[PDB]
A and B are shown apart, each in its own frame.
Chain A
Amino acid sequence: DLSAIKIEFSKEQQDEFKEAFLLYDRTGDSKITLSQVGDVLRALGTNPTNAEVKKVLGNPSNEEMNAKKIEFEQFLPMLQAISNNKDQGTYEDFVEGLRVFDKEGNGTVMGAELRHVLATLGEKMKEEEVEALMAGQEDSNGCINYEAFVKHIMS
């Protein structure tokens, strides 16, 4: 499974990923806890779901995420597998998904409607995480241009 992953990243890329991975080391053992794996995969440019992250780690329990650690050499093929699993979602696919909540005609969904979707549907996001995404997004009256919101998260 991880042994079967062939590494495609260039030598230069691998060294940069190691430097980035080590910024997450909080104890000086050159390792990160499994709970930080998602943040490092994302920092490096991938957009895996929490389900995809759990799947590469070999579906560990919620306790094993906080207690078990990982070395760069073991994380590297995981990053390759996530990168190969090409997170298919195109810009137009995301605006069509959000267009469903229009209610009105214009290209704008309401403030609390988008918050409810991100925090209660799919892979439920934390309240504080949703607030961070709304970084000056709601216009006056309390509405968000969903087309502009998709560009913002994809930036």
Chain B
Amino acid sequence: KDADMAIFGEAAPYLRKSEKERIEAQNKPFDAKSSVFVADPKESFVKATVQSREGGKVTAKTEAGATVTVKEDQVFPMNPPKYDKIEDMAMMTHLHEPAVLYNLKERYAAWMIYTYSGLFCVTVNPYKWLPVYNAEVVTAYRGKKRQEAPPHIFSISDNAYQFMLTDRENQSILITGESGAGKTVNTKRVIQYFATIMQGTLEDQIISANPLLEAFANAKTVRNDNSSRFGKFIRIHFGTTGKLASADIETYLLEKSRVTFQLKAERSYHIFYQIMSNKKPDLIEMLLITTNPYDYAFVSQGEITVPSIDDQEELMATDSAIDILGFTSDERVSIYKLTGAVMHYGNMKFKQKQREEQAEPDGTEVADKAAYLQSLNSXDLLKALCYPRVKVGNEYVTKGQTVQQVYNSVGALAKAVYEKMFLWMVTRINQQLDTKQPRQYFIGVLDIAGFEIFDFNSLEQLCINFTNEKLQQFFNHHMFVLEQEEYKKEGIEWTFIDFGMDLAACIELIEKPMGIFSILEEECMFPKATDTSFKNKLYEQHLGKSNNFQKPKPEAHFSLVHYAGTVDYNITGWLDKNKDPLNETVVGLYQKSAMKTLAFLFTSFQTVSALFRENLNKLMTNLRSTHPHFVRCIIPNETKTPGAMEHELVLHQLRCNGVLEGIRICRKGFPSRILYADFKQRYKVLNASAIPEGQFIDSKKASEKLLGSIDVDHTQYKFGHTKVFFKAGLLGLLEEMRDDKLAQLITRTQAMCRGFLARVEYKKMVE
């Protein structure tokens, strides 16, 4: 139906293959016994034509003309040409690794990046902008059922919205993936979808909230040029009818360490480079800075420029987002000024006094700029750093500080200002998004920092990778546990199956009492504790006692076998990273600042990791009370190359995500379920005579009678207590029959109209 796809416009060839290609696939010959996939050393799996089968081995000729021989256990059956580039992989005759691999590969080769996998969706990063996110495409997806339109992030969004109204339930859209997979892009598309359907309106403000927070919380990393260094859960609130009422953003821990530290091949937060890009020369003047990042110690330890990023154009986007969000002129200045002060703090120099270990300023020029930007007296700032108060009501009793203690405190203060400003911006955005409209339900979109492996992995990477493990286990519990219980709850005949998808071994190791975080938190409460005493406790009760806790063989201190791979961690400074101490004397000066924003930033757990675990636990608890929709992002290659796909990398991701296992439960189970009242209402059209008006049959009985009267395989559905459950594809068939029946009834109604008019005209001729 190339006419039906014309509503998508220029996006049509990128969402669904042509009607000509579909007809060619239907008429392409195929010998089932000779068309096979064969395991390959170089490519993992290759398509091949069997030449000979003998003595338990198969000799086949590949597409590339090469002759290959394998045992019969390494030969997989190929699906026929009608299943080429299939939109739902749960519909393939044969489901195995090469089939899923090659379906994703072939769809990706036509630039079709979305593909259904039973109850969830998979997306492979194109590394290029495709015209599939136009306003015309948003329009085309509105109201469409999952079967009525090509796979897309907009369809997942719309479907979640439909479930929200029909079940009167909160929904959540959970987007999976390792660093650089496409979680942030897909999160922004979900936001775009719901928003589309001077200070801006709620719709403009929801859209603009991301570019602002990305300037301050995203940074270039080895795996991603725009890496999210904070997690977010955006709730989009809707009223009883389904009108977009409000929105809110919740952010989790920001990676504060990045403000003052960078590895060789990474940058700090985008904002520093955006400011110094000189697109707005007035900002350079206002902040008392230069356009050379190398002049700032805290933000020039790694890279400075990123070929894919135009820091000038991005500064315009950040400034424009501040305008749409409605920050006052004073608030906007304070945001930039505090950022400038953070840069200056890093350049402050200190030296020991003669015959002492006590610190004293090594010049005051830098301190003068930072204090100007913070509306503080620079002499008070320097005295508070070198001589902090012991007691609250006494300014005479002070403790000394060495040069290293002052530098450390300066780092901690710069991070606290930055982090608190980041949290204040979120608070401000939320005040703008709170329309005070009545709200009944919401759809939450989760965008966490993805699984990452660097050359050096610290406490930040452990928390990020643990968050990913907890989220993979949430998918596992939903797909392989709650789904089976859902069948039993509805009275459907079902014998439990153990899918063996359970990450409890690694999760227990990290979060159980006496686990890694428990040992770290325990060592934080001993002032005599060192990195080595922490390393020793970890080894004493986890090495050789847990299979997921290993020593690195070929530097790192321990290795954890995560769901997505083995990661080598280094425990240097973990005790210092887990405590959040500030110089309270300097905090007192910030509270008294004439800069109202800074004074506001400084006006409950014992460690940072305990707060982290609670944020994580609260999120998982909240997600339990929603109907989740999973989007699994996949990177095709590790070089950001558009269109190129490394087979083993994709297979690795499919495996640890449990994609094939998830497709298997959708094939064995009933992935589609409709409430009887909603079924009767939608599909009576198929055979209205089966449910005549004169009978007062209830919704459930009418559905039974209707399904039993149409040409459908009667084994593809089962009756639950409140819903009819369907095997994969039956809803697509019912939807296809509905579309056909509605088209016929319109022409038949027109034929009646034509008949009516011809008979009234004939009546006039008779008289």
Contact B759 A121 (CB under 8 A): no
- Which 7 A-B residue pairings sit nearest by Cβ, starting from the closest? A97-B745, A42-B758, A43-B762, A89-B748, A47-B755, A122-B746, A122-B747
Contact B757 A49 (CB under 8 A): no
Given contacts A92-B692, A92-B693, contact A97 B758 (CB under 8 A): no
Contact B754 A125 (CB under 8 A): yes
Contact with A along B314-335 (1 / 0, CB 8 A): 0000000000000000000000
Contact A97 B742 (CB under 8 A): yes
CA distance A93 to B751 in the complex (A): 14
CA distance A87 to B692 in the complex (A): 20
A96 at the interface (CB under 8 A from B): yes
Contact with A along B722-747 (1 / 0, CB 8 A): 00000000000000000000110111
Chain B residue total in the interface (Cβ 8 A): 27
Contact B755 A121 (CB under 8 A): no
Given contacts A43-B762, A96-B688, A100-B685, contact A89 B745 (CB under 8 A): yes
Contact B684 A96 (CB under 8 A): yes
96-131 of chain A: CB within 8 A of chain B: 96-98, 100, 117-118, 121-123, 125, 129-130
CA distance A38 to B765 in the complex (A): 16
A39 at the interface (CB under 8 A from B): yes
B144 → A minimal CB distance (Å): 15
Given contacts A39-B758, A39-B761, A43-B759, contact A96 B745 (CB under 8 A): yes
A27 at the interface (CB under 8 A from B): no
Chain B residues, Cβ within 8 Å of A48: 751
Which residue on chain B has the smallest CB distance to residue A43?
A: B762
Contact A49 B751 (CB under 8 A): yes
Contact A20 B762 (CB under 8 A): yes
28-75 of chain A: CB within 8 A of chain B: 38-39, 42-43, 45-52
A3 at the interface (CB under 8 A from B): no
Which residue on chain B has the smallest CB distance to residue A92?
A: B688
Contact A49 B748 (CB under 8 A): yes
Contact A47 B688 (CB under 8 A): no
B40 → A minimal CB distance (Å): 52
Contact with B along A78-89 (1 / 0, CB 8 A): 000000000111
Contact B748 A87 (CB under 8 A): yes
Which residue on chain B has the smallest CB distance to residue A119?
A: B750
CA distance A154 to B757 in the complex (A): 11
B756 at the interface (CB under 8 A from A): yes
Contact A87 B757 (CB under 8 A): no
CA distance A58 to B746 in the complex (A): 24
B689 at the interface (CB under 8 A from A): yes
Contact B751 A96 (CB under 8 A): no
B753 at the interface (CB under 8 A from A): yes
Chain B residues, Cβ within 8 Å of A123: 747, 750-751
B620 at the interface (CB under 8 A from A): no
CA distance A133 to B757 in the complex (A): 8
CA distance A39 to B751 in the complex (A): 11
- Contact residue range for chain A? 35 or more
CB pairs A–B below 8 angstroms (18 shown): A39-B758, A39-B761, A43-B758, A45-B759, A46-B755, A47-B755, A49-B747, A49-B754, A90-B689, A93-B688, A96-B745, A97-B745, A97-B748, A100-B685, A117-B746, A118-B749, A118-B753, A153-B753
A105 → B minimal CB distance (Å): 12
A23 at the interface (CB under 8 A from B): yes
Chain B residues, Cβ within 8 Å of A4: none
Chain A residues, Cβ within 8 Å of B712: none
Chain B residues, Cβ within 8 Å of A100: 685, 742
A60 → B minimal CB distance (Å): 18
CA distance A47 to B749 in the complex (A): 9
Given contacts A42-B758, A122-B743, contact A90 B688 (CB under 8 A): yes
Chain A residues, Cβ within 8 Å of B747: 49, 51, 122-123
B397 at the interface (CB under 8 A from A): no
Contact B754 A47 (CB under 8 A): yes
CA distance A42 to B746 in the complex (A): 18
Which residue on chain A has the smallest CB distance to residue B749?
A: A94
Which residue on chain A has the smallest CB distance to residue B748?
A: A89
Given contacts A94-B748, A96-B684, contact A42 B742 (CB under 8 A): no
Chain A residues, Cβ within 8 Å of B746: 97, 117, 121-122
**From DSSP, what is the main secondary structure of chain B's interface residues?**
helix
B689, B743, B750, B758: residue with the most chain A Cβ atoms closer than 10 Å: B750
Chain B residues, Cβ within 8 Å of A133: 753, 756-757
B752 at the interface (CB under 8 A from A): yes
668-718 of chain B: CB within 8 A of chain A: 684-685, 688-689, 692-693
Contact B754 A97 (CB under 8 A): no
CA distance A94 to B753 in the complex (A): 11
Which residue on chain B has the smallest CB distance to residue A94?
A: B749
A67 → B minimal CB distance (Å): 21
Given contacts A92-B688, A92-B693, A153-B756, contact A87 B751 (CB under 8 A): yes
Chain A residues, Cβ within 8 Å of B692: 92
Chain B residues, Cβ within 8 Å of A94: 745, 748-749, 752
Chain B residues, Cβ within 8 Å of A121: 743, 746
A130 → B minimal CB distance (Å): 8
Given contacts A23-B765, A129-B757, A132-B757, contact A96 B750 (CB under 8 A): no
B746, B748, B749, B757: residue with the most chain A Cβ atoms closer than 10 Å: B749
CA distance A150 to B692 in the complex (A): 17
CA distance A64 to B27 in the complex (A): 36
Contact A125 B745 (CB under 8 A): no
Chain A residues, Cβ within 8 Å of B752: 47, 89, 94, 150, 153-154
**Supplied contacts A20-B762, A93-B689, A97-B685, 9 more A-B pairs, CB within 8 Å:** A42-B758, A49-B750, A49-B754, A92-B692, A97-B742, A97-B749, A100-B742, A118-B749, A154-B756
CA distance A42 to B689 in the complex (A): 25
A100 → B minimal CB distance (Å): 6
Which residue on chain A has the smallest CB distance to residue B766?
A: A23
Given contacts A20-B762, A92-B688, contact A122 B754 (CB under 8 A): no
Chain B residues, Cβ within 8 Å of A97: 685, 742, 745-746, 748-749
A41 → B minimal CB distance (Å): 8
Which residue on chain A has the smallest CB distance to residue B752?
A: A153
Chain A residues, Cβ within 8 Å of B689: 90, 92-93
CA distance A132 to B25 in the complex (A): 47
CA distance A39 to B758 in the complex (A): 6
Chain A residues, Cβ within 8 Å of B759: 42-43, 45
Chain A residues, Cβ within 8 Å of B755: 42, 46-47, 153
Contact B754 A96 (CB under 8 A): no
Contact B765 A89 (CB under 8 A): no
Chain A residues, Cβ within 8 Å of B762: 20, 23, 39, 42-43
CA distance A87 to B755 in the complex (A): 11
286-322 of chain B: CB within 8 A of chain A: none
B135 → A minimal CB distance (Å): 22
Chain B residues, Cβ within 8 Å of A39: 758, 761-762
Which residue on chain A has the smallest CB distance to residue B692?
A: A92
Contact A125 B685 (CB under 8 A): no
Given contacts A43-B762, A122-B750, contact A96 B685 (CB under 8 A): yes
A56 → B minimal CB distance (Å): 14
Which residue on chain B has the smallest CB distance to residue A88?
A: B748
Given contacts A89-B748, A96-B685, contact A129 B742 (CB under 8 A): no
Contact with A along B583-602 (1 / 0, CB 8 A): 00000000000000000000
CA distance A49 to B539 in the complex (A): 83
CA distance A130 to B757 in the complex (A): 10
